[PDB]
């Protein structure tokens, strides 16, 4: 016989035939999957009285456990079973309700914001419902669904109930973001955006996808705060960190201006004791809302290579020092310019100064290299100024050895961030980055949390899925959609700090990047490591920047340039194609295919809605949803593994079946050169920066030890090709 506990409490006989039909349904269209295999694995686990939801988890996991490179369609079998389950969990049936009935219920329960019902009529929801294709749920992979279920879909944390499905998520994000559009265009934009996201052409960050449509207005996922050399700014900085990490934002802290250990008694304000005690304070601030005091809350802190304390700073996350010599749960960005590198090559010295003893040196470091050189050499003379000398080879080695040993000491080329930038370095210098080293935006110190004259940069992110687009001209519509969706959100969201609101309203800065690059290269038969992708990458990223700029341009015509457009190099008719690192000419000869001069005039005349548009970020979650390779990164392998409380989640790289040979796995790359050239070619067009990785497999090197010679040569190759930043250093375990 075998009985089954129903949804209520009622019990009825098992329907093995029903189970078979769901499985047959789920397996439709798929290849190399065995329904009967799934049955064998799951049925043996059934017991008299088993509840109905547990029969469901059982078949899902059974199908999931057969995901492999040889049978990758088990990703989709499991996915569909999981979807079906989630329909039942949310609606009591497979068919979703009508959009209007769903939104009304959710507003009742307080799970959707009621402005959706204010801003749209029943007629309009009826119409939106005709845009919706709930069958698009059938296109998720299993790992994708686990992410939807884990962090996207509106649900109860406590009770475990799921209240929506993916197409309502998608339609309602569109609905919310475009809700102030004139009725003439509104539902057009809603439809087009819903299409773009539901078919995976555009990806959005987790805070947006989980939050937009709910009663919250907190969606800011990364902030950039600059600390001034005063207790007031130190306090303000700290306070702003606390406020933001409580909303689970990642933090980039510029702390390079804090004067060094042993600097004169400023009267009261005690800067004698130096940087580290303050660095520890930012770290507790960053961890102020984390359960362990480690788990959650993340920050990257920035300082210049020539800071008097640099030797002490470089080793802040090294394993064994005294406890007061370490600040281990924050990452660092070491800031470097051309002169520093020149000292290395010439085998000369680097002179270390406290920023407080060298008038104008700090400002020049970012804004004006000739001026930096003048002041630097001037101050190396002057023996009245407190200074210290280190061998450049010694200093760089210390940095590179800490970078390698932790993977988490990062690099920012501050000249590149300002010579090749949408900002006039004399008005709005880029003097730091964010958590992940792809955001490059102006900041100003605060003298108090609510100081109206400070500037905090936030960034507003999205990505094009280069695998989901048949040709580059699709980027025009997608750029219109992405730029407009993000621009609306800037007005839509709230700002916990006046300085953050200033930055956003003033410059309206966007950071749109890409996912699925590796797959895209593979299907064009290119690779990372051999230069075979150089021209395609030029072609690809020209199209991205062109169309992004075009979209933001049209939007400026329609709605006005951003308040501080006059502080951009774009305002002076300067384009990314004018200011890039020239050495790039030697490694690609792709012509520009778009009318950049037409655009140049149109930008000078009408301005840009957004001061920046593009930034190449990492993606973990965004790209699992699309079954896409992460950002611009080569896959570590063909199948990725995640632990979860529900079993091992496997995801096979897209079209493994036809592309296994076309892929170039991370560790197949003979070295970093090809990749870094691709990053450089990308950086030609990108407004901000790129989360560029460096990788080393010890087993490719004599005695399994990575030579410093090579660590430094890749560093210099980065610089030569105008790479703004370097993020993680991956060293292979094995």
How open is the CA angle 636-641-645, to the nearest 5 degrees?
155
Instruction: Choose the contact partner of 730 out of its own copies, other proteins, none; CB within 5 to 8 A by kind.
Output: none
Q: Which residues lie closer than 8 Å to 267 by C-beta, 6 or more apart?
A: none
259 known member of a binding site = yes
Q: Where are the alpha helices (DSSP H) in 287-348?
A: 310-313, 338-345
Full DSSP string of 526-561: --STTSTTHHHHHHHHHHHHHHHHHHHHHHHHHH--
Residue 41 binding: pick among its own copies, other proteins, none (C-beta 5-8 Å cut-off by kind)? its own copies
Binding mask 45-64 for other proteins (x = CB under 8 A): --xxxxx--x----------
Q: DSSP letter string over 439-507?
A: -----B--SSTT-TT-B-EE-EEEEEETTS-SSGGGHHHHHHHHHHHHHHHHHHS--SSHHHHHHHHHH
Q: Which of 427, 676, 691 is nearest to 567 (CA)?
A: 427
CB of 193 to other proteins, least distance (A): 39
Long-range pairs, 592-596, Cβ under 8 A, ≥24? 592/542, 593/539, 593/542, 593/543, 594/542, 594/543, 594/546, 596/546
708 binds, among other proteins, its own copies, none (CB under 5 to 8 A by kind): other proteins
529 binds, options its own copies, other proteins, none, Cβ within 5 to 8 A by partner type: its own copies
Of 227 and 485, CB closest to its own copies: 227
- 456, 459, 466, 422: which is closest to 437 by C-alpha? 459
CA 587 vs CA 121, 525, 530, 533, 593: distances in Å: 56, 19, 11, 11, 18
First-to-last C-alpha distance (Å) of the chain:
52
Measure the CA–CA gap between 477 and 74, rounded to whole angstroms: 34
> Contact, 432 vs 442, CB < 8 A?
no
Q: If residue 212 lies in a helix (H) or strand (E), which one and from where to where? A: none
Across 14-100, where does the E strand assignment appear?
A: 50-51
Smallest distance, Å, CB 586 to other proteins?
11
Q: How far is the CB of 408 from its own copies (least distance, A)?
A: 21
- Residue 11 token pair: 């019990």
471/703 with CB nearer other proteins: 703
Residue 531 contact among other proteins, its own copies, none, beta carbon within 5 to 8 Å by kind: its own copies
CB of 717 to its own copies, least distance (A): 7
434 among the known binding-site residues?
yes
* Residue closer to other proteins, measured from CB, 336 or 463: 336
* Separation CA 352–CA 388 (nearest Å): 5
Q: Is 30 in the site for other proteins (CB under 8 A)?
A: no
Task: Indicate the residue among 110 and 321 with the shorter CB distance to its own copies.
Answer: 321
- Cα pseudo-dihedral 344, 346, 352, 353, rounded to 10: -120
Site for other proteins in 322-341 (CB under 8 A): 338, 341
544 is written with which tokens?
A: 């991205």
Of residues 573 through 592, those in contact with other proteins by CB under 8 A are: 583
Q: Is 373 in the site for other proteins (CB under 8 A)?
A: no
CA distance 84 to 651: 20
Residue 266 counted as an annotated binding residue: yes
Residue 458 bridge partners (DSSP): 223
- Shortest CB 674 distance to its own copies, Å: 5
Q: Helices 338-345 & 708-720, crossing angle to 10 degrees?
A: 140
Q: Which stretch binds other proteins (CB under 8 A): 12-20, 100-108, 356-364, 393-401?
A: 393-401
Taking the least distance from each CB to other proteins, the nearer of 130 and 159 is 159
Which of other proteins, its own copies, none has residue 312 at its interface (CB below 5 to 8 Å by kind)? none
What part of residues 698-717 is at the interface with other proteins (CB under 8 A)? 698, 701, 703, 705-709, 711-713, 716
Contact positions with other proteins (CB under 8 A) in 617-656? 645
Rounded to an integer, what distance in angstroms lies between the CA atom of residue 248 and that of residue 286? 10
**Catalytic residue list contains 630:** no
Whether residue 52 is annotated as binding a ligand: the answer is: yes
Identify residues 73-112 at the interface with other proteins (CB under 8 A): none
Residue 554 is a catalytic residue: no
- Using CA atoms, how far apart are residues 380 and 260, in angstroms rounded to an integer? 17
Pick between residue 110 and residue 707 the one whose CB is nearest to other proteins. Answer: 707
Q: Which member of 164, 309, 438, 567 is catalytic? A: 438
Return d(Cα 102, Cα 104) in angstroms, integer.
Answer: 5
Query: Under 8 Å CB-to-CB from 240, ≥6 apart: which residues?
Result: 223, 225, 446, 449, 456, 497, 499, 500
The CB-of-281 to its own copies minimum distance in angstroms stands at: 4
Binding mask 252-291 for other proteins (x = CB under 8 A): ----------------------------------------
Partner from its own copies, other proteins, none contacting 5, C-beta within 5 to 8 A by type: other proteins
State the nearest-atom distance from the C-beta of 719 to other proteins, in Å. Answer: 6
Is residue 470 annotated as a catalytic residue, yes or no?
no
Which option in other proteins, its own copies, none does residue 719 bind, with CB closer than 5 to 8 A by kind?
other proteins
Please select the residue that binds other proteins; options are 62, 143, 212, 344, rule is CB under 8 A: 344
Q: Mind telling me the catalytic residues?
A: 434, 436, 438
Residues at the interface with other proteins (CB under 8 A): 5, 47-51, 54, 338, 341-342, 344-347, 393, 397, 400-401, 404-405, 583, 645, 698, 701, 703, 705-709, 711-713, 716, 719-720, 731
Binding-site residue numbers for GDP are: 206, 434, 438, 620-622
């Amino acid at each position: 016989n075998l009985l089954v506990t129903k949804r209520d409490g009622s019990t009825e006989r098992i329907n093995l035939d029903k189970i078979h039909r769901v499985l047959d349904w789920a397996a439709e269209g798929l290849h190399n999957v065995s329904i009967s295999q799934v049955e064998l694995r799951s049925h043996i686990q059934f017991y008299d009285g088993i509840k109905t939801s547990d029969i469901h988890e059982t078949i899902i996991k059974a199908a999931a456990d057969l995901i492999s490179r040889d049978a990758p369609d088990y990703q989709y079998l499991a996915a569909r079973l999981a979807i079906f389950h989630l329909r039942k969990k949310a609606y009591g049936q497979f068919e979703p309700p009508a959009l209007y009935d769903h939104v009304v219920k959710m507003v009742e329960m307080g799970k959707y914001d009621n402005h959706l019902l204010e801003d749209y009529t029943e007629e309009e929801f009826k119409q939106m419902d005709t845009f919706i294709d709930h069958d698009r749920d059938m296109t998720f992979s299993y790992a994708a669904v686990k992410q939807l279920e884990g962090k996207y879909l509106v649900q109860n944390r406590v009770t475990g109930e799921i209240y929506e499905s993916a197409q309502f998520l998608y339609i309602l994000v569109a609905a919310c973001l475009f809700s102030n559009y004139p009725r003439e265009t509104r539902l057009q934009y809603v439809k087009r955006f819903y299409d773009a996201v539901s078919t995976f052409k555009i990806s959005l960050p987790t805070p947006i996808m989980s939050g937009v449509r709910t009663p919250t207005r907190q969606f800011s996922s990364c902030v950039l705060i600059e600390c001034g050399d005063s207790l007031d700014s130190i306090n303000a900085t700290s306070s702003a960190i606390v406020k933001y990490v409580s909303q689970r934002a990642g933090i980039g802290i510029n702390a390079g201006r804090i004067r060094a250990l042993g600097s004169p008694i400023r009267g009261g304000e005690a800067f004698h004791t130096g940087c580290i005690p303050f660095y520890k304070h930012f770290q507790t601030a960053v961890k102020s809302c984390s359960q362990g005091g480690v788990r959650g809350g993340a920050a990257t802190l920035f300082y210049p290579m020539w800071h008097l304390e640099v030797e002490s700073l470089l080793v802040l996350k090294n394993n064994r020092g005294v406890e007061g010599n370490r600040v281990r749960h924050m990452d660092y960005g070491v800031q470097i310019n051309k002169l520093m590198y020149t000292r290395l090559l010439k085998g000369e010295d680097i002179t270390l100064f406290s920023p407080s003893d060298v008038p104008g040196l700090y400002d020049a470091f970012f804004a004006d290299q000739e001026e930096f050189e003048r002041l630097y050499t001037k101050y190396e003379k002057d023996d009245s100024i407190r200074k210290q000398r280190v061998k450049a080879v010694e200093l760089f080695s210390l940095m590179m050895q800490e970078r390698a040993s932790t993977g988490r000491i990062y690099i920012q080329n501050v000249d590149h961030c300002n010579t090749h930038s949408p900002f006039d370095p004399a008005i709005a210098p880029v003097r730091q980055s964010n958590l992940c080293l792809e955001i490059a935006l102006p900041t100003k110190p605060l003298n108090d949390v609510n100081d109206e004259n400070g500037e905090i940069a936030l960034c507003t992110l999205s990505a094009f899925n280069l695998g989901a687009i048949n040709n580059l001209d699709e980027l025009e519509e997608l750029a219109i959609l992405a730029v407009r969706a993000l621009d609306a959100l800037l007005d839509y969201q709230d700002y916990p700090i006046p300085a953050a609101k200033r930055g956003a309203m003033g410059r309206r800065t966007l950071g749109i990047g890409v996912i699925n690059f590796a797959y895209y290269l593979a299907k064009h038969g290119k690779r990372y490591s051999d230069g075979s992708a150089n021209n395609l990458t030029h072609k690809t990223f020209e199209a991205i920047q062109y169309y992004l700029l075009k979209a933001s341009n049209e939007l400026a015509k329609e709605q006005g340039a951003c308040p501080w457009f006059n502080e951009t190099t774009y305002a002076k008719g300067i384009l990314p194609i004018d200011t890039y690192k020239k050495d790039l000419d030697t490694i690609a000869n792709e012509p520009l295919h778009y009318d950049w001069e037409a655009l140049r005039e149109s930008i000078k005349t009408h301005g840009l809605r957004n001061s920046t548009l593009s930034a190449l970020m990492p993606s973990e979650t965004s790209s699992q949803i699309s079954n896409a390779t992460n950002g611009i990164e080569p896959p570590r392998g063909y199948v990725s593994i995640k632990a979860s409380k529900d079993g091992i989640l496997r995801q096979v790289v897209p079209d493994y079946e036809h592309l296994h040979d076309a892929y170039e796995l991370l560790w197949e790359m003979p070295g970093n050169d090809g990749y870094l050239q691709l990053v450089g070619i990308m950086q030609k067009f990108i407004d901000q920066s790129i989360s560029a990785n460096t990788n080393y497999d010890p087993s490719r090197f004599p005695s399994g030890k990575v030579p410093m010679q090579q660590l430094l040569k890749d560093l210099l190759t980065a610089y030569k090709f105008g790479v703004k930043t370097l993020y993680y250093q991956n060293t292979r375990d094995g």
